[PDB]
Automatic annotation (TrEMBL):
<dbReference type="GO" id="GO:0000272">
    <property type="term" value="P:polysaccharide catabolic process"/>
</dbReference>
<feature type="disulfide bond">
    <location>
        <begin position="95"/>
        <end position="100"/>
    </location>
</feature>
<keyword id="KW-0146">Chitin degradation</keyword>
<keyword id="KW-0624">Polysaccharide degradation</keyword>
<dbReference type="GO" id="GO:0006032">
    <property type="term" value="P:chitin catabolic process"/>
</dbReference>
<dbReference type="GO" id="GO:0008061">
    <property type="term" value="F:chitin binding"/>
</dbReference>
<feature type="disulfide bond">
    <location>
        <begin position="175"/>
        <end position="196"/>
    </location>
</feature>
<keyword id="KW-0378">Hydrolase</keyword>
<feature type="disulfide bond">
    <location>
        <begin position="388"/>
        <end position="397"/>
    </location>
</feature>
<dbReference type="GO" id="GO:0008843">
    <property type="term" value="F:endochitinase activity"/>
</dbReference>
<keyword id="KW-0326">Glycosidase</keyword>
<dbReference type="GO" id="GO:0030246">
    <property type="term" value="F:carbohydrate binding"/>
</dbReference>
<dbReference type="GO" id="GO:0005576">
    <property type="term" value="C:extracellular region"/>
</dbReference>
<keyword id="KW-0119">Carbohydrate metabolism</keyword>
<protein>
    <recommendedName>
        <fullName>chitinase</fullName>
        <ecNumber>3.2.1.14</ecNumber>
    </recommendedName>
</protein>
<keyword id="KW-0732">Signal</keyword>
<comment type="similarity">
    <text>Belongs to the glycosyl hydrolase 18 family. Chitinase class II subfamily.</text>
</comment>
Length: 567
């Protein structure tokens, strides 16, 4: 027998190989930065410096032959290709007429985007997140935002993964018209323009590749040579810890919806659907697609956009066309893919789409039962209430009434229940509807006692402007505040109110507030009680379950209440 091969670790790139090639130190077009190969190129050097080297070699992964070739004297390079990611015990065997000799086994790493090659992610979750025994058939969803790793300092390993069925990753942009992105900033718009260089309009790209796959997270054990890093590598490792977890990319949202209005032309839908198929094959940890078009018919960031006649049919056709594509992927891979959408629940939004038609192609509708009122104007209201609040005028709840100035309420008020009922009224099955909880508040200032029409209800007052605060308080944008900020800075440990604030609750609407009478600061949010009410509502109607926006803003209280209400 020949001398047993000695595998050359140093000369073989430390046995680290990858199906994906990702730019780490530059920023350019998506197709320039991201290169996916169906087979990883494997190059293993070995030596047989003493005795006979033999005629041929065999390469084994976990005792199974994967490659063969000729020995070239006392130093041989074994080159081959491999289409499956993972960690394998590799042996290299040398053979001649007398027999064969196997090397010592050594671990080879082949990176793929399913995370097969990765150990379960090490978690660092706030212990306030409690343990539950929620029925696994109940949707318990949340949004994780790409940009949350910056100021918000909220990373993948912070997510209470055991308390979640679905993680929606916000947000995936579509190349094309994107003027609304400028409302976030020039930097964000420029990032998107850079990502879209050498990319056809209406194709998907990664907005922030630094956050997505470049940034080294030490808690994930990322090193200079690690082929996949950032949030994406961490989500891959998360899937290894929780293999039943569904991770779904969310396309669009408030500032990334502009290209959706061009989907009235099927040619653009064709381009989009094809790019999503490619995206899902490239990033294998993803379990389907979430469409967050805000909104068919208009009413989104771009005030001028919207086709009330053609957007609904385009939306239905998109769902049908995505489902056809996902079915293709299911046949090719043996996997199951989900198709979802986050939708507006105001009467004016729902009426622009036949959801009974659209939903036949969809697994879930994430009903965005929040943002009903906010600092965009001086009108206080419950931003995420279940029912009609005390502040609402006669005829406001169901519509048909008139406001304080005499202008007609053209449709039902913005509440969670009104939205759900309008969807059911179209004939949408309850078991496809997912009810939304808010992990943040919206707020005003200047709502002082003298502005109230009902002295016991600050929701009847009038504001002078938006809520202001620091990022330490969870105020990243004026008029918006993390729930964990509200708890730490307005509610306090006993929810009795701190720093000048009092707690209140509209028992009818199922909606909490905190109110500082002196400054007139007023915040509308979800708390334990209102979330329980939502959970009880979901059970009663046989809804699919609950979802939340956004997990980084929770301290555990909201997701805790979600599970406790679904019990």
């Amino acid at each position: 027998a020949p001398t047993a091969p000695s595998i050359d670790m140093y000369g073989s790139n430390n046995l680290q190989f990858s199906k994906i090639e990702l730019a780490m130190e530059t920023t350019s077009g998506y197709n320039d930065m991201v290169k996916y190969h169906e087979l990883a190129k494997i190059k293993v050097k070995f030596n047989q410096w003493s005795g006979t080297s033999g005629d041929t070699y065999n390469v084994y992964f976990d005792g199974v032959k994967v490659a063969t070739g000729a020995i070239t004297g006392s130093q041989t390079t074994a080159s081959f290709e491999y289409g499956q990611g993972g960690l394998y015990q590799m042996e290299i065997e040398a053979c001649d007429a007398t027999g064969c000799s196997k090397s010592a086994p050594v671990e080879i790493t082949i990176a793929d985007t399913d995370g097969s090659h990765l150990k379960p992610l090490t978690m660092n979750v706030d212990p306030n997140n409690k343990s539950y025994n929620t029925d696994p058939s109940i949707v318990m969803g949340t949004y994780f935002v790409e940009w949350g790793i910056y100021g918000r300092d909220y990373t993948v390993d912070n997510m209470p993964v055991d308390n979640l069925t679905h993680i929606l990753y916000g947000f995936i942009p579509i190349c094309g018209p994107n003027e609304s992105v400028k409302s976030v900033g020039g930097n964000s718009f420029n990032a998107l323009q850079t990502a879209c260089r050498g990319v056809n309009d209406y194709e998907v790209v990664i907005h922030d590749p630094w956050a997505a796959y470049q940034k080294s997270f030490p808690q994930a054990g990322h090193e200079y040579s690690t082929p996949i890093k950032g949030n994406y590598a961490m989500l891959m490792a998360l899937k290894q810890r929780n293999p039943d977890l569904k991770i779904i990319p969310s396309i669009g949202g408030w500032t990334l919806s502009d290209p959706f209005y061009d989907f009235v032309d099927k040619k653009n839908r064709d381009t989009f659907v094809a790019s999503v198929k490619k995206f899902l094959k490239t990033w294998k940890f993803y379990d389907g697609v979430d469409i967050d078009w805000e909104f068919p018919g208009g009413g989104g960031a771009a005030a001028d956009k919207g086709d009330p006649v053609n957007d609904g049919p385009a939306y239905i056709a998109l769902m049908r066309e995505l489902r056809v594509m996902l079915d293709e992927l299911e046949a090719e891979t043996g996997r199951t893919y989900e198709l979802t959408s986050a939708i507006g629940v105001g009467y004016d939004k729902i009426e622009d789409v036949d959801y009974a038609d659209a939903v036949q192609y969809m697994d879930y509708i994430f009903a965005m039962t929040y943002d009903f009122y906010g600092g965009w104007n001086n009108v206080p209201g419950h931003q995420t209430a279940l029912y009609c609040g005390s502040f609402m005028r006669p005829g406001q709840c169901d519509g048909g009434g008139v406001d304080e100035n005499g202008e007609p309420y053209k449709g039902p008020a913005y509440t969670a229940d009104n939205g759900i009922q309008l969807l059911l009224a179209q004939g949408v099955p309850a078991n496809k509807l997912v009810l939304g909880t808010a992990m943040y508040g919206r707020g005003w200032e200047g709502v002082t006692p003298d502005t109230l029409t009902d002295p016991n209800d600050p929701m009847t007052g009038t504001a002078t402007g938006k809520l202001k605060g620091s990022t330490a308080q969870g105020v990243w944008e004026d008029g918006v505040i993390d729930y964990k900020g509200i708890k730490s800075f307005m509610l306090g440990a006993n929810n009795t109110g701190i720093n000048g604030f009092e707690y209140g609750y509209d028992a009818q609407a199922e909606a909490p507030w905190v109110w500082n009478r002196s400054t007139g600061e007023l915040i509308t949010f979800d708390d334990h009680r209102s979330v329980l009410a939502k959970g009880n509502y979901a059970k009663s109607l046989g809804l699919a379950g609950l979802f939340s926006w956004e997990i980084d803003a929770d301290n555990g209280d909201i997701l805790n209440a979600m599970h406790e209400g679904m019990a």
